[PDB]
Design a protein around this ligand. Structure first.
Ligand SMILES: [Zn+2]
Lengths: 62, 256, 58, 64, 69, 98, 304, 115, 57, 131, 171
RNA sequence: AUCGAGAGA
């Protein structure tokens, strides 16, 4: 019931520390369901074209 | 590029073959590949020249960098007459011969597998895996060899040739046991779950002796002499006391 | 309440529409059944919170 | 409380099947009583797995 | 809902056989096996398509918004 | 175009080579493999599809000498055409006869 | 050695039946790699004509538009695939379809109640008009020059009594489907065969002679026409192994488990090609063989 | 999922030519790994496959209410008798062929109809 | 007030009933399929009290 | 050249859960303390109990290439020819040595006096069998 | 008893009681019993196992101790009980048919299976509750084969041609 | 934004 002050914003699992410094939301990441594939290298991952066009990497030209 | 190098060298997949918890391996093939290997690496498997070459090129592909010799090298067949015939163990030997780097001796490993020698007949020795100069000469490849098992062929290859060669061997065995399971598919059905008439009669005969074990155990727990009827008033009173008392109930449960 | 399935399909509901639920804001709701103590029966109870209630309480 | 482990079994039934001994196989099927007992066991297993999936979650963070 | 035009497993057109199947069940006292055999459905993959069709479109059709009821 | 020579797996003398074919599958791969293994000069022949979801086929030919993997491939294709022609002719004759 | 001449000398074809829909023929002394290529090409490489693009103008029925278009696409047509070319997809839809690669069907059915319906009746064909929409209602509309090329052969479905939709009074469907050439590897609606598979000729190797009352039950373990009894001695023998489907009922009996082995003739295939209706099974097989030959020839002429 | 808890996602749409085809010419529309069964022990799925194939062949419906069979009268026996009468084999196994190579597989494959 | 009770599940009582929980008395009858729908009307709950607990008897 | 040769009398044959292979127990006809246990593909070379086999181990048959026209080899004089590797030597007793061969997985255990088995060195050796 | 429950005759009537039909063995007529009295009365599960001077009642059928969903599971006495429970949980999560009057509703989400089929294998209670009006899934030809390599852990393989003929389609 | 119901591993 009481309005959360400035101490409660920095107190528990939902507090500022454990929810915004010890764990954060990140750009350049993806999530999906995993399906098996034996025709791919054991050290490889199969990335759909839906991810492959949105995810990007800064490559400086030379 | 800093995080790229960190992920490709320190956090990458093939450098984590062994868990730091106890040093045991954690990577390998699981179900279809394991059964395919058990079927491929038995004495009963023979392959003509074209079949052997097709399996070898299916698993190993030099144009992808899978081969260290730039040219696939094969073995003389284990049977010369009436017509040439290879063996699945020769396919394993050729896989190792083509992925293991040259200018190095082959793996000398002596280990066992999970399947005894009584599951192959009298006088068999297929439980005792045996490598010599990278040639599978005895035993069957099992879960204990490829998979997450210590001191198998994949772990030994890791130790002797680095993590990259073990990763390549896992990939090559995955492709091999996939292409083999396509042509000689694996299946289970109702007949696998059936006993014979003699098996059913054995089961019935033994289970007919389970009718009185509960009564005998109850008589032992209640400190009553054996051969007492299941509806004796004193036995019923003692069982009532045992029902009331949790510890005596646990004792009766343990004995029965 | 007493409409036969023919009348039920005529009134746009369903052939074998069943009851037991309410409609509020166009969203169907049900009052879930809950399990409670048997009525009109004195049942002996042993509970540590009975002693925790106060002092000298068994 | 009556000494019956199920309505089917008479009170204080000294028999293995009464106490939960299933003499039945999934190939041939299990009787209704053994089905009931096996459901008891499966429910207990599901509960234990649900608890154990995170009963050890605080220890790792307290250490780390 | 409505009879599948082609069998899933093989592809034999079974969509033109639902009405004739119902007629064979209704007029003649043919059971489902004999009716399916006479319709020309040999493989059990084809037999199941007409044997197990539910035809729910008949129940769907009574809710007609374009007709006075 | 359609047929591609994988130069990073081809012998300098041409005795061994690897080919990549687009929009092909087991259908042509196995037929070509069978018809090429009948060549007395080839030492190694096999087909492989890298990934099922892709339409690419890989052919490996290793000759014993005096010829080329390309020549073995050409001979296999010609012999496959001849086999198709003879089966078609026999089927036509049997259709007419009945 | 092996050669095309030796294959020609050792190759035979035994056509057992030939109808307008099903052909049953044997390929003798041929390799599995070639028989399988023929089977695969018949299933998913022979071109056919089926509805691809559907232009709905109104659909007030219970069946949704996508389901109705899919169900229309699944209908087989009595169209010879050689009478039209392939659509170049790179072109825009304004001129993608021409008079020589697309066949334009149409459907315009409007349900109305029948005032003359007998009382107490339940039959939708008497209660309503156009209560059932059938594939035969897919009216062929000739376009351009094809009004002269298709004059002798109208574009009608292979099965005209396919139940495409049902209606109730006031509900109307008005669409216009375009059907083009396509292969069964693109979509299963294009496969010109219902099923086109093969099987190895069964082999029933009788090891020890079976005579007397034992020969009675040995015959019954198979289909009735396979195992026969010699007139002279009451033996058992294989009359026709083509008439046998391998159920291994013999191996269930310890009486005959030690007296016969079951196998195949590994280079004797028993084909069975059932067509959907667009073309004859013998022409389907012809086209599959020619497709394999032309595929090999195109690969040969491709510059490596 | 089936009606026995055998859930699982779909990996790939396998083309019908690459699918294994039976001797009767039918390619199954659902392939389930045999390794899913030993750990779960859903023998009811095997029995349902047997009864579904038998019922589809004979045009009948098979009742699967629990406890209609016992140790003496096994559903395997019952549906195997029906399959053998229909001409298929007792144990529900069908001789199939590889769809990629074409050769017959090592053993008869267990096929049937399940919901 | 009855509509509020049915919409929220909260048992806003000035006196309190003989029940333990105060919220989650009404569930939304989902229509994913008829099996779900029919099972909505056959379920009996112990209470929200025992969800947040450790004892498993 | 040949390294060993004898006339062996097969005594026991059993498939043992196998279809193509079987394990035999052959006792030499001449040598009184020489025996043999061998795995053979009994679909390419069926054998029976109380048979007689002419086994021979040869260092060569004078890289592998399918046989062509006008090619002579030692195998032409024999029916069944294998090719393997020696991986173990044992000293059963005094003047008794057991040699272990593995032909691509099929195992042979040739036990005999080392006067005759002295030529058998631990390397690749061809096995030839004749009825 | 000896230190058991408190003895007495406790007749009950009124609302909220839980009742089930069970066959009274004398005079062979339906009887109604409750949880309070059940735990003291002998109720055989099958007429084959009535014991003389022991049982007073018998179940009408062993299947009337399960729920509707538990009764609709085929051959559930051949399965592991956790798998039966998973089936009960997942049969209500299927994209089946919610109803037929779907043009007179405005629900936030609806999952409808286009073409369902009556099962070939179904319990006798499938007809009694009229589940044919709501076909949940479809019959499929399922091969228990390790052939693809893409369906190892729990994944499965769907025929592409079947999927292209509206197999499993839904809206 | 908060508290209630449920779902997936
Ligand atoms: Zn079909």
């Amino acid at each position: 019931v009481p309005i959360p002050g400035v101490k409660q914003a920095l107190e528990k699992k939902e507090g500022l520390f454990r929810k915004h410094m010890m764990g954060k939301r990140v750009n350049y990441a993806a999530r999906s369901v995993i399906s098996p594939d034996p025709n791919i290298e054991t050290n490889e991952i199969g990335v759909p074209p839906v991810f492959a066009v949105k995810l990007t990497y800064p490559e400086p030209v030379t | 590029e800093n995080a790229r190098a960190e992920a490709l060298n320190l956090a990458n997949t093939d450098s984590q073959y062994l868990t730091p918890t106890s040093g045991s391996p954690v990577r390998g093939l699981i179900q279809d590949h394991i059964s395919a290997g058990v079927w491929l690496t038995s004495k009963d498997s023979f392959f003509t020249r074209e079949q052997y070459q097709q399996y070898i090129y299916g698993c190993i592909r030099p144009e992808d960098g899978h081969t260290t010799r730039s040219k696939i090298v094969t073995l003389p067949p284990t049977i010369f007459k009436p017509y040439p015939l290879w063996t699945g163990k020769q396919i394993i030997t050729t896989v190792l011969l083509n992925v293991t780097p040259p200018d190095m001796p082959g793996i000398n490993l002596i280990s066992k597998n999970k399947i005894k020698n009584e599951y192959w007949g009298k006088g068999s020795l297929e439980n005792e895996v045996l490598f010599k100069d990278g040639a599978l000469l005895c035993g069957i490849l099992d879960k204990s060899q490829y998979g997450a098992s210590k001191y198998g062929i994949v772990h030994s290859l890791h130790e002797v040739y680095g993590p990259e060669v073990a990763a390549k061997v896992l990939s090559v065995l995955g492709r091999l046991f996939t292409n083999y399971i396509t042509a000689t598919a694996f299946t289970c059905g109702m007949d696998d779950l059936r006993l014979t008439a003699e098996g059913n009669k054995w089961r019935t005969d033994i289970l007919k002796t389970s009718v009185d074990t509960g009564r005998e155990a109850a008589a032992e727990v209640t400190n009553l002499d054996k051969d007492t009827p299941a509806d004796d008033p004193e036995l019923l009173k003692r069982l009532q006391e045992i029902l009331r008392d949790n510890n005596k109930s646990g004792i009766l449960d343990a004995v029965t | 309440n007493k409409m036969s399935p023919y009348e039920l399909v005529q009134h746009k509901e369903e052939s074998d529409e069943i009851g037991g639920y309410f409609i509020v804001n166009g969203i169907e709701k049900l009052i879930r059944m809950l399990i409670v103590q048997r009525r009109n029966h004195p049942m002996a109870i042993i509970r540590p919170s009975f002693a925790n209630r106060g002092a000298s309480y068994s | 409380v009556s000494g019956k482990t199920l309505p089917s079994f008479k009170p204080y039934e000294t028999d293995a099947m009464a106490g939960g001994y299933v003499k039945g196989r999934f190939y041939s099927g299990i009787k209704p009583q053994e089905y009931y007992f096996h459901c008891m066991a499966g429910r207990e297993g599901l509960i234990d797995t649900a608890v154990k999936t995170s009963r050890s979650g605080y220890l790792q963070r307290c250490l780390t | 809902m409505i009879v599948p035009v082609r069998c899933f497993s093989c592809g034999k057109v079974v969509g033109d056989k639902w009405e004739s199947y119902l007629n064979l069940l209704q007029e003649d006292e043919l059971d489902e096996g004999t009716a399916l055999s006479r319709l020309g459905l040999k493989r059990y993959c084809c037999r199941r398509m007409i044997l197990t069709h539910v035809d729910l479109i008949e129940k769907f059709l009574r809710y007609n918004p374009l007709e006075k009821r | 175009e359609k047929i591609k020579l994988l130069t990073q797996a081809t012998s300098e003398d041409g005795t061994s080579a690897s080919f990549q074919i687009v929009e092909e599958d087991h259908t042509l791969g196995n037929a070509l493999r069978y018809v090429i293994m009948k060549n007395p000069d080839v030492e190694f022949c096999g087909y492989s599809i890298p990934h099922p979801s892709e339409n690419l086929l890989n052919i490996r030919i290793q000759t014993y000498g005096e010829t080329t993997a390309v020549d073995a491939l050409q001979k296999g294709l010609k012999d496959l055409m001849d086999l198709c022609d003879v089966v078609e002719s026999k089927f036509t004759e049997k259709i007419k006869s009945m | 050695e092996w050669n095309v001449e030796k294959f020609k000398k050792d190759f035979e074809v035994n056509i057992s039946s030939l109808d307008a829909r099903e052909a049953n023929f044997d390929l003798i002394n041929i390799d599995t790699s070639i028989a399988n290529a023929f089977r695969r090409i018949m299933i998913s490489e022979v071109p056919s004509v089926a509805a691809e693009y559907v232009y709905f103008f109104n659909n007030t029925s219970v069946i949704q538009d996508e389901v109705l278009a899919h169900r229309i696409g699944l209908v087989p047509l009595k169209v010879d695939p050689d009478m039209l070319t392939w659509v170049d997809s790179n072109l825009p839809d304004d001129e993608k379809f021409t008079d020589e690669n697309t066949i334009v069907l149409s459907l315009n059915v409007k349900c109305t109640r029948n005032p003359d319906a007998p009382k107490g009746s339940t039959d939708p064909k008497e209660l309503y008009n156009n209560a059932h929409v059938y594939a035969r209602d897919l009216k062929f509309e000739p376009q351009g020059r094809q009004s002269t090329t298709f004059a002798d052969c109208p574009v009608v479905p292979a099965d005209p009594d396919i139940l495409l939709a049902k209606l109730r009074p006031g509900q109307e469907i008005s669409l216009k489907a375009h059907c083009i050439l396509g292969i069964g590897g693109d979509h299963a609606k294009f496969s010109p065969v219902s099923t086109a598979s093969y099987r190895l000729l069964p082999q029933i190797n009788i090891l020890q002679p079976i005579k007397g009352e034992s020969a009675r039950r040995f015959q019954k373990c198979f289909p009735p026409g396979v195992i026969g009894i010699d007139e002279g001695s009451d033996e058992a023998y294989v009359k026709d192994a083509r008439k046998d489907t391998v159920s291994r009922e013999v191996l269930r009996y310890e009486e005959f488990a030690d007296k016969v082995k079951l196998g195949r003739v590994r280079n004797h295939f028993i084909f069975n090609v059932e067509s959907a209706g667009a073309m004859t099974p013998e022409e389907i097989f012809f086209k599959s063989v020619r497709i394999l030959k032309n595929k090999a020839e195109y690969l040969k002429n491709c510059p490596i | 999922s089936s009606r026995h808890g055998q859930k699982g996602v779909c990996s790939r749409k396998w083309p019908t030519i690459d699918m294994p085809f039976s001797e009767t010419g039918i390619q199954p529309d659902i392939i389930i790994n045999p390794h899913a069964f030993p750990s779960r022990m859903t023998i009811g799925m095997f029995v349902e496959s047997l009864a579904g194939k038998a019922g589809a062949l004979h045009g009948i419906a098979q009742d699967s209410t629990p406890w209609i069979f016992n140790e003496d009268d096994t559903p395997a026996d019952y549906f195997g008798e029906q399959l053998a009468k229909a001409g298929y084999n007792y144990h529900g196994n069908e001789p199939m062929y590889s769809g990629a190579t074409g050769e017959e597989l090592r053993a008869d494959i267990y096929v049937g109809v399940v919901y | 007030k009855m509509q509020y009770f049915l919409s929220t599940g909260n048992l806003v009582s000035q006196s309190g009933l003989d029940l333990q929980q105060v919220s989650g008395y009404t569930v939304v009858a989902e229509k994913i399929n008829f099996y779900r729908f029919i099972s909505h009307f056959r379920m009996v709950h112990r209470g929200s009290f025992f969800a947040q607990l450790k004892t498993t008897t | 050249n040949t390294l060993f040769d004898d006339i062996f009398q097969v005594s026991e044959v059993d498939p043992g859960r196998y279809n193509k292979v079987c394990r035999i127990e052959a006792a030499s006809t001449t040598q009184d303390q020489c025996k043999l246990t061998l795995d053979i593909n009994v679909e390419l070379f069926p054998v029976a109990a109380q048979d007689s086999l002419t086994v021979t181990i040869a260092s060569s048959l004078n890289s592998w290439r399918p046989p062509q026209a006008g090619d002579r080899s030692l195998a032409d004089d024999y029916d069944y020819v294998m090719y393997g590797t020696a991986y173990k030597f044992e000293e059963v007793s005094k003047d008794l040595i057991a040699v272990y061969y593995s032909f691509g997985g099929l195992l042979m255990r040739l036990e005999g006096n080392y006067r005759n088995l002295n030529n058998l060195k631990q390397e690749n050796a061809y096995l030839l069998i004749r009825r | 008893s000896t230190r058991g429950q408190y003895p007495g005759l406790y007749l009950f009537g009124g609302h909220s009681r839980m009742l089930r039909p069970v066959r009274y063995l004398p005079l062979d007529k339906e009887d109604i019993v409750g949880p309070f009295e059940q735990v003291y009365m002998n109720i055989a599960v099958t007429p084959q196992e009535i014991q003389n001077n022991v049982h007073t009642h018998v179940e009408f059928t062993p299947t009337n101790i399960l729920s509707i969903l538990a009764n609709l599971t085929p051959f559930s006495d051949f399965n592991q009980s956790p798998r039966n429970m998973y089936q009960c949980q997942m049969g209500k999560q299927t994209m089946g048919t919610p109803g037929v009057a779907l043009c007179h509703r405005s629900d936030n989400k609806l999952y409808r299976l286009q073409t369902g089929q009556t099962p070939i294998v179904k319990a006798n209670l499938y007809d009694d509750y009229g589940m044919d009006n709501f076909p949940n899934g479809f019959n499929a030809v399922v091969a228990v084969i390790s052939y693809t390599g893409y369906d190892m852990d729990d994944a499965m393989i769907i025929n592409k041609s079947a999927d292209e003929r509206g197999f499993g389609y839904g809206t």
